[PDB]
């Protein structure tokens, strides 16, 4: 249990590190976000099964629901970005410097 939770926390931290340290592509950052969601879902399910608290299992499924909605709107924004610039690069949305 403790080693499992330590490793899942380290994994969340790695995915957060990826999300913070951008590269050219945006979808990679969206995927890192989904990986954080995965880590958290797994941690919550493991905790609820270790505690035998079957009243908290409805929580991780909601986590997944909202994470996937976030992913959907992210993909839509990605579509718009590609339509505008032809690519999902981040170095192109730098005109709001004024």
């Amino acid at each position: 249990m403790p080693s499992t939770f330590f490793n899942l926390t380290m994994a969340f931290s790695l995915s957060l590190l990826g999300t913070l340290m951008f590269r050219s592509h945006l979808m990679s950052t969206l995927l890192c976000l989904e990986g954080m969601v995965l880590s958290l879902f797994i941690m919550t399910s493991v905790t609820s099964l270790n505690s035998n608290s079957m009243s908290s299992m409805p929580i991780p499924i909601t986590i997944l629901v909202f994470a996937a909605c976030e992913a959907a709107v992210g993909l839509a924004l990605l579509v718009k970005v590609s339509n505008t610039y032809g690519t999902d690069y981040v170095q192109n949305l730098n005109l709001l410097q004024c």
Binding site: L14, S15, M27, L31, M54, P58, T62, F66, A68
Partner: protein
């Protein structure tokens, strides 16, 4: 045995690391599928199956859509892999080595409440009801319909609104 769940968690960690290194979203979705498979395995190893199969199906659909999208928006002439860039491969190997170091030095200097290589496999399923009939995980997730009705309307409205919202965003 006894090293089973730890190996699962380590594979999940490596998958998430190779994901965070941000190769072409193709291999990133691959790593995410693998990490979801490992998460399913570990959730099953802790007692619950419904949640594991669920998350697996969900992320499979998601990575299907993500493949469809990256082949249209997030592609390149020469897509990058973990091996393509010497620097990325080096930091990947470095991360594996650093995980090894952290584990082997915490076992030594730290207490056993985090990582106990000696004593592994002893703390997975602390307590259980040996005479039990109604312990499946789906009972909790079905509580949504009877007891936790609030989470259900919340999620359903999230999805409704999401439909309307994605339509409005994609309007040209």
């Amino acid at each position: 045995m006894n090293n089973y769940i730890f190996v699962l968690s380590s594979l999940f960690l490596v998958g998430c690391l190779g994901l965070a290194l941000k190769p072409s979203p193709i291999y990133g979705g691959l790593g995410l599928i693998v990490s979801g498979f490992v998460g399913c395995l570990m959730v099953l190893g802790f007692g619950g199956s419904f949640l594991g199969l669920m998350v697996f199906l969900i992320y499979l659909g998601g990575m299907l859509v993500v493949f469809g999208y990256t082949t249209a928006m997030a592609t390149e002439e020469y897509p990058e892999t973990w091996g393509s860039n010497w620097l990325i491969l080096g930091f990947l190997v470095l991360g594996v080595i650093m995980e090894v170091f952290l584990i082997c030095v915490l076992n030594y200097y730290d207490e056993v409440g985090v990582i106990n290589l000696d004593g592994l496999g002893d703390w997975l399923m602390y307590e259980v009801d040996d005479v039990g009939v109604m312990l499946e995980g789906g009972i909790g997730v079905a509580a949504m319909y009877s007891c936790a009705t609030w989470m259900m309307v919340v999620a359903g409205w999230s999805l409704f609104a999401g439909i309307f919202i994605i339509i409005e965003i994609t309007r040209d």
